[PDB]
Amino acid sequence: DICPASEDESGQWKNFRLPDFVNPVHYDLHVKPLLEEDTYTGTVSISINLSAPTRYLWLHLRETRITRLPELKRPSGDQVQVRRCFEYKKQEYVVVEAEEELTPSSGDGLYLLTMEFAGWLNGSLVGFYRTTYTENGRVKSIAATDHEPTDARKSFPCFDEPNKKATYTISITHPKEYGALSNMPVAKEESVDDKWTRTTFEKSVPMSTYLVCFAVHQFDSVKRISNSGKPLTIYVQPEQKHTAEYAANITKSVFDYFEEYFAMNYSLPKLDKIAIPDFGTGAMENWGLITYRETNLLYDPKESASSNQQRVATVVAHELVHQWFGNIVTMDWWEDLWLNEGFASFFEFLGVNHAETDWQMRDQMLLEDVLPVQEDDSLMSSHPIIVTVTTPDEITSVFDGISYSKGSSILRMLEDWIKPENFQKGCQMYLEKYQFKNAKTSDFWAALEEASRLPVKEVMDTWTRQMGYPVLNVNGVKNITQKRFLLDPRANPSQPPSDLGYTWNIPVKWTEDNITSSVLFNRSEKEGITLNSGNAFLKINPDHIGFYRVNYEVATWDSIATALSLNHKTFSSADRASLIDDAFALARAQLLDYKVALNLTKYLKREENFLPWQRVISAVTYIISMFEDDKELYPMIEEYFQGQVKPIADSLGWNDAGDHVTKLLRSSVLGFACKMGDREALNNASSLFEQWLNGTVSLPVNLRLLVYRYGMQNSGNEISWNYTLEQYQKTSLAQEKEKLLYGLASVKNVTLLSRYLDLLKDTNLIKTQDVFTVIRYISYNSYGKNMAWNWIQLNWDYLVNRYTLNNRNLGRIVTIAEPFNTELQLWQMESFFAKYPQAGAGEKPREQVLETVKNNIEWLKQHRNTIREWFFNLL
Ligand SMILES: *[C@@H]1O[C@H](CO)[C@@H](O[C@@H]2O[C@H](CO)[C@@H](O[C@@H]3O[C@H](CO)[C@@H](O)[C@H](O)[C@H]3NC(C)=O)[C@H](O)[C@H]2NC(C)=O)[C@H](O)[C@H]1NC(C)=O
Ligand SMILES: *[C@@H]1O[C@H](CO)[C@@H](O[C@@H]2O[C@H](CO)[C@@H](O[C@@H]3O[C@H](CO)[C@@H](O)[C@H](O)[C@H]3NC(C)=O)[C@H](O)[C@H]2NC(C)=O)[C@H](O)[C@H]1NC(C)=O
Ligand SMILES: *[C@@H]1O[C@H](CO)[C@@H](O[C@@H]2O[C@H](CO)[C@@H](O)[C@H](O)[C@H]2NC(C)=O)[C@H](O)[C@H]1NC(C)=O
Ligand SMILES: *[C@@H]1O[C@H](CO)[C@@H](O[C@@H]2O[C@H](CO)[C@@H](O)[C@H](O)[C@H]2NC(C)=O)[C@H](O)[C@H]1NC(C)=O
Ligand SMILES: *[C@@H]1O[C@H](CO)[C@@H](O[C@@H]2O[C@H](CO)[C@@H](O)[C@H](O)[C@H]2NC(C)=O)[C@H](O)[C@H]1NC(C)=O
Ligand SMILES: *[C@@H]1O[C@H](CO)[C@@H](O[C@@H]2O[C@H](CO)[C@@H](O)[C@H](O)[C@H]2NC(C)=O)[C@H](O)[C@H]1NC(C)=O
Ligand SMILES: *[C@@H]1O[C@H](CO)[C@@H](O)[C@H](O)[C@H]1NC(C)=O
Ligand SMILES: *[C@@H]1O[C@H](CO)[C@@H](O)[C@H](O)[C@H]1NC(C)=O
Ligand SMILES: N[C@@H](CC(=O)O)C(=O)O
Ligand SMILES: [Ca+2]
Ligand SMILES: [Zn+2]
């Protein structure tokens, strides 16, 4: 109404990107929430460095409206006359037009633009919003922001681009019962009424809009002091105060470690962490005020699993890395997002490894990031690490496996190639150089090239400017050639077009005889290279350190199987996992006969290590799901793999004994036993479940999930379903809540699963943050695979309206269709996608799940008989 929408394209505001010549220096931001009303108002003053003649000034704004006609100042101080304001929806701009036009800011003086705005706190988990929780029977409120990537513009009008760094002084007018937090410490608190307080924070260092954060809360706090002498506090509900302790410990330890590792001081005087009762992502690295989902921050040693403990530790560490990589140095544009996320996903393992020494964290990188993303990046519908993005939906989409996991994986290879010491120093120099500014990928290579003198740009560009990765083909034990690895054998290996033509500069490592050698495999060695006393066995890619797969000659693979059966310890735990992972991926890709891959599983009755079991289970889970409906194959696969885990499942038992990694092993090994239908394992689950239903017995923390799942699956009924639902409401610990939701999703009852799906529309029962988690759990249920799939179709309009097409999690929900493997199911998917063709942030996931389902159909056609023969002949 005041700044009406206009379809006027005839200006520079038609461009997706902000202009080069308008730059913010300082933001004066004031917001006043009306918490009980779900509204807020605010005014913002922005100091602007103008570089070119313009009759129009524009910046980002979404949903939140301008309420007063904005006022502009010249660097001299004079009021500039304003003809009109208008909104341009297509690119999310509010544009104001001066009568006349004005000239560049020449000296130390700047233009000043102030605008008045009003927005909503309800119906959303982005921008500035309010949510509730219960304390001593009273409903309490908390308000916070969440901006990454393009949501700062919902909170307040701003230049919402990562490279438009400005300095911030924030103030909030709030009721006095509430405290206020932001990026910086409190500077002054002044009484407005005897009811309202105005909290003003001290000036920030230069930072990006997406990092700007404020909150209004009535939380308690657990406190720690760094070696720097700076306060590190975690804000937490009084009820949950005891569960903030562990996160407090890790923050201390990892904060102290990183400041020392990066040779650079944390740029702010304090650091705060807070978990919002309803929060849309895992966690957010808002400088000095890191926000969390409760499951990623709050941990109870008496109730939470080792899995949960590691998750809290890892996310906290991840969030800390960002204080350096992301906050101090930011990417210039979202195309270089991996400079934030890859680095965070890499250093997270070093952080936690320092804090928890016997967790074998560096090895766990293989399970968490490397091997899972080698599945992703073997699809045609992957994308290069450096990604072209032209809409907010494309921007948000690239917060994915590639940015995080592949980013992490190629740094891991890079570090090993370049040696840790030099990698460390190179990172420090980069951090020194671009501090409080923005960097491109090219800048990071040059920094490490200064630190090692190795050809970093030349080599790392191949891993970064094209999607995918190579398989090394072994000829004659010693000759290797490279070829792009694709899961679909029919796919065109040259597509989509790449300047580098899908050949890589591969840093290659191998183990001769406990002795390690290194070679860079050059791109232009078109006919391959030869690996430098006379040998009978070459172990290529030790600990799967390089982002590629190795395909040995079939005779070699045969010998590996035999060697595993004789003495499996001949290979390290990591090497076993890697060989198993490669073989099964190769078999999946029709590059190795399945009988050869399956032969590697024969030794398993003697396997006792975490890493090989995890990758075995990953590979079997896929094969088993492809044959779910096959009454001939399934029992045979079940019978075999049941026999292979039985010894380790029996050996570890149903009890929380041993170190961290052992406890993780027990979880997944007992789970697989249950999955494979081991009567004794299932009876343990039922027995414990029955006891838990008696309402006193606290289950062993690392067995709970399994007990809820397989207990409910095997002996669940309405009475125990209702009980479980009550328990979920009653527990304060989010980590327990999440397990109970999985339990509820496990019942073998269409009526009860139907009730559960209906609860998704009930915001008093299922939090907005948990809807997609629940749908995904239900999709795992043998009945619910189809129910969840059908429910998202029937309720698509509802979900879009509730979340918007810009919601990443909504975009991704179609991946519940991944297990599909028939032409009928593919037709359903295509029909539904054609009916709702506006995919938003779901565009990539749609492409990916379609490719996956097409692959599944082909896979069945190619491999059913082969796999059938192997099992039939064996049993
Ligand atoms: C939870 O799972 C446990 C397995 O991990 C079950 O314990 C097993 O019960 C079996 C039957 O009671 C035993 O089988 C016997 O095994 C011995 C070999 O040591 C054989 O001689 C026998 O053929 C066989 N049956 C006999 C002699 O009647 C297992 O030995 C036993 N223990 C282990 C460690 O595997 C639990 O019963 C199960 N708990 C619940 C509540 O179901
Ligand atoms: C690598 O995988 C190979 C291919 O499956 C294995 O070789 C197969 O072993 C089976 C014995 O376990 C044989 O299958 C069947 O054996 C029964 C005996 O009970 C006979 O009746 C069947 O006739 C026979 N099947 C067929 C089709 O003849 C196979 O003889 C054999 N397959 C081949 C092609 O030789 C290897 O053992 C395995 N290598 C390892 C573990 O190192
Ligand atoms: C938050 O609540 C407000 C007010 O209830 C919502 O705006 C209303 O939307 C309904 C239904 O579309 C209309 O009938 C009302 O006239 C609107 N009220 C006002 C004051 O404009 C708003 O949609 C909610 N915000 C979000 C983001 O969902
Ligand atoms: C956080 O750190 C403290 C100290 O570093 C951990 O140690 C506890 O306190 C005493 C003495 O400090 C130790 O002897 C005990 O082993 C610890 N527990 C108890 C109950 O006293 C503490 O465990 C850490 N908090 C966690 C992991 O949540
Ligand atoms: C799934 O759960 C429903 C709900 O408990 C079961 O239906 C109940 O059946 C009993 C008798 O067996 C009746 O007394 C209840 O009134 C029924 N409830 C409802 C809502 O109809 C149903 O039997 C279960 N189905 C399976 C296959 O186990
Ligand atoms: C289990 O929980 C449900 C939900 O609270 C119970 O209540 C019935 O639920 C149906 C819908 O599923 C409603 O239409 C009925 O009005 C509810 N009946 C009431 C409130 O009395 C259900 O009765 C519970 N069953 C058991 C065995 O505890
Ligand atoms: C950096 O940290 C050191 C050691 O903790 C401290 O003494 C110093 O004040 C800091 N220097 C700067 C420039 O921030
Ligand atoms: C491997 O490559 C080298 C040099 O190109 C050649 O001498 C040798 O014959 C090749 N083949 C095998 C099986 O070693
Ligand atoms: N940066 C966030 C993602 C987001 O909030 O969009 C995370 O890593 O959890
Ligand atoms: Ca966000
Ligand atoms: Zn991150």
For 807, the token pair is: 């919601």
Collapse the DSSP code of 643 into the 3-class scheme (helix H, G, I; strand E, B; otherwise coil) and give the result: helix
Q: State how far the Cα of 442 lies from the Cα of 450, in Å rounded to an integer.
A: 12
**Cα separation values, 602 from 561, 566, 615, 640, 644, Å:** 8, 11, 15, 10, 8
User: Are 382 and 374 in contact, with CB atoms under 8 Å apart?
Assistant: no
Those residues whose C-beta lies under 8 Å from the C-beta of residue 651, and which sit 6 or more positions away, are: 608
- Measured from the Cβ of residue 21, the count of other Cβ atoms closer than 10 Å reads 13
Element (H, E) at 169: strand 167-175
CB 332 within 8 A of CB 686: no
Residue 284 in contact with ligand 9 by CB distance below 6 A: yes
Burial class (CB in 10 A: 0-12, 13-18, 19+), 679: exposed
Nearest to 558 by CA among 596, 612, 605: 596
Same domain? For 284 and 190 the reply is: no
Determine the Cα–Cα distance for residues 791 and 5; give it in Å rounded to an integer: 36
Amino acid at the residue 664: L
- List the beta bridge partners of residue 271: 232
Q: Closest Cα to atom 14, ligand 8: which residue?
A: 476
Ligand 7 centroid–CA 730 distance in Å is 47
In the 8-state DSSP scheme, what is residue 302? Answer: T
DSSP-derived secondary structure letter, 406: I
Amino acid in position 67: T
Q: Is the dihedral of CA 726, 731, 737, 743 positive or negative?
A: negative
Q: What is the largest CA-CA distance in the chain?
A: 90
DSSP SS3 for 256: helix
CA separation for the pair 254, 356 (Å, rounded): 10
**Tokens for 840?**
């938003």
Alpha-carbon span 574 to 690, nearest angstrom: 38
Residue with token string 């709970």: 704
Cβ proximity of 496 and 502 under 8 Å: no
With 0-12 / 13-18 / 19 or more C-beta atoms within 10 angstroms meaning exposed / middle / buried, residue 210 is buried
Q: How far apart are CA 228 and CA 152, in angstroms?
A: 31
The last residue of a domain, from among 468, 485, 515 = 468
Which structural domain, as residue segments, surrounds residue 132? Answer: 1-219
One domain, residues 330 and 427: yes
Name the residue with tokens 């936690």. Answer: 352
Burial class (CB in 10 A: 0-12, 13-18, 19+), 477: middle
Whether 601 is in the pocket of ligand 2, judged by its Cβ within 6 Å, is: no
Burial label, 693 (beta-carbon count in 10 A; 0-12, 13-18, 19+): middle
Does 210 sit in the ligand 9 pocket, CB within 6 Å?
no
- 3-class secondary structure, 816: helix
Q: Which two tokens stand for residue 291?
A: 């926000």
Give the atom of ligand 7 at the shortest distance from the alpha carbon of 228: 5
Identify the CATH number of the domain in which residue 494 sits.
2.60.40.1910
Closest-CA residue to 346 (of 415, 428, 262): 415
- The owner of tokens 């590629």 is 548
Q: Work out the angle between the directed axes of helices 407-418 and 420-433 (0-180°, nearest 10).
A: 120
Same domain, 502 and 597: no
Contact 464, 448 (CB under 8 A): no
Final residue of a structural domain among 411, 436, 468: 468
My answer on whether 464 and 481 are in the same domain is: no
DSSP 267-283: SSS-EEEEE-SS-SSSE
Q: Which amino acid is at 213?
A: C
Same domain, 201 and 288: no
Distance (Å, whole) CA 715 – CA 391: 49
Query: Which amino acids bring their CB within 6 angstroms of ligand 5?
Result: 718, 749, 751-752
**CA atoms 326, 328, 329, 333: torsion sign:** positive
Q: Cβ(762) to ligand 6 under 6 A?
A: no
Bridge partner residues of 118 (DSSP): 41, 65
- Residue 200's identity, in one-letter code, is T
CA 273 to chain centre: 19
Which ligand neighbours the alpha carbon of 594 most closely? 2
Looking at the structure, tell me whether residues 112 and 158 fall in a common domain. Answer: yes
Distance CA 285, CA 343 (A): 13
Strand partners, 45: 28, 114
* Residues 471/485, Cβ–Cβ less than 8 Å: yes
Clarify whether residues 731 and 795 are in a common domain.
yes
3-state DSSP helix/strand/coil % of the chain, to nearest 5? 45, 20, 35
Structure-solving method: X-ray
Per the structure block, which two tokens stand in for 592?
A: 């190795």
What residues have CB less than 8 Å from 436, skipping those under 6 apart?
Answer: 165, 205, 206, 267, 328
**CA–CA separation, 327 vs 320, rounded Å?**
10
Note whether 60 and 163 are same-domain residues: yes
Residues 302, 217: contact at Cβ < 8 Å?
A: no
Residue 202 structure tokens: 């001290």
User: Using the 8-state DSSP alphabet, how is residue 204 labeled?
Assistant: P
Length of the chain, in residues: 875
Please give the C-alpha separations between residue 86 and each of 19, 50, 53, 95, 306, in angstroms, as whole numbers. Answer: 18, 20, 20, 5, 54
Q: How far is Cα 870 from Cα 875, in angstroms, rounded to an integer?
A: 9
d(C-alpha 628, C-alpha 689), whole Å? 26
CA 224 / ligand 8 centre spacing (Å): 62
CATH of the domain at 183: 2.60.40.1730
Residue type, 277: P
Which is nearest to 427 in space by CA: 339, 521, 512, 361?
339
Residue 868 beta carbon below 6 angstroms from any ligand 2 atom: no
- If you measure from the C-alpha of residue 267 to the centroid of ligand 7, how many angstroms do you get, rounded to a whole number? 10
- Interacting residues of 228 by C-beta distance below 8 A, sequence separation 6+: 259, 265, 266
3 state SS of 109: coil
Atom of ligand 7 nearest to the CA of 265: 1
- Separation between Cα atoms, residue 860 and residue 67, nearest integer Å: 61
In the residue annotation, 319 being an active-site residue is answered as yes
In the reported structure, the alpha carbon of residue 265 is separated from the centroid of ligand 7 by a whole-number distance in angstroms of: 6
- Alpha carbon of 318 to those of 368, 406, 721, 776, 784: distances in Å? 13, 15, 36, 25, 34
Q: Is 839 helix (H, G, I), strand (E, B) or coil?
A: coil
Q: Are 454 and 599 found together in one domain?
A: no
Residue type at 677 in one-letter notation? G
Angle at 647 between CA 645 and CA 652, to 5 degrees: 95
* CATH number of the domain where residue 676 is located: 1.25.50.20
Question: Are both 159 and 241 inside the same structural domain?
Answer: no
Structure tokens at 719: 């009475």
Mutate to test the pocket of ligand 6, among 719, 722, 761 (most ligand atoms within 8 A of CB): 722
**Which whole-number Å values give the CA distances from 161 to 19, 210, 239, 701, 841, in the listed order?**
11, 8, 39, 44, 19
Co-location of 67 and 96 in the same domain: yes
In the DSSP assignment, the letter for residue 202 is: P
**Among residues 415, 448, 468, which one ends one of the domains?**
468
Residue 269 and residue 174 share a domain:
no
Contact 522, 530 (CB under 8 A): no
Encoded tokens for 763: 């915001």
- Catalytic residue selected from 87, 259, 294, 319: 319
CB 737, CB 771: distance < 8 Å: no
Ligand 1 atom closest to 680 (CA): 2
| Residue 113 contacts residue 48 (beta carbons within 8 Å) | yes
Q: What is the CATH number of the domain that holds 371?
A: 1.10.390.10
> What whole-number distance in Å separates Cα of residue 195 and Cα of residue 493?
67
Instruction: State in Å: Cα 698 to ligand 1 middle.
Output: 24
Cα–Cα separations (whole angstroms), residue 840 to 7, 11, 391, 680, 829: 22, 26, 9, 47, 17
Alpha-carbon separation of residue 567 from 564, 570, 604, 665 (angstroms): 5, 6, 11, 21
> Which tokens hold the place of 554?
């079939």
- Which of 155, 57, 35, 43 shows the shortest CA–CA distance to 105? 57
DSSP bridge partners of 23: 49
Q: Is 755 in the pocket of ligand 6 (CB under 6 A)?
A: yes
Cβ of 281 less than 6 Å from ligand 9: yes
Resolution in A: 2.4
Task: Give the chain's domain count.
Answer: 4
Tokens representing residue 815 in the block: 């991946």
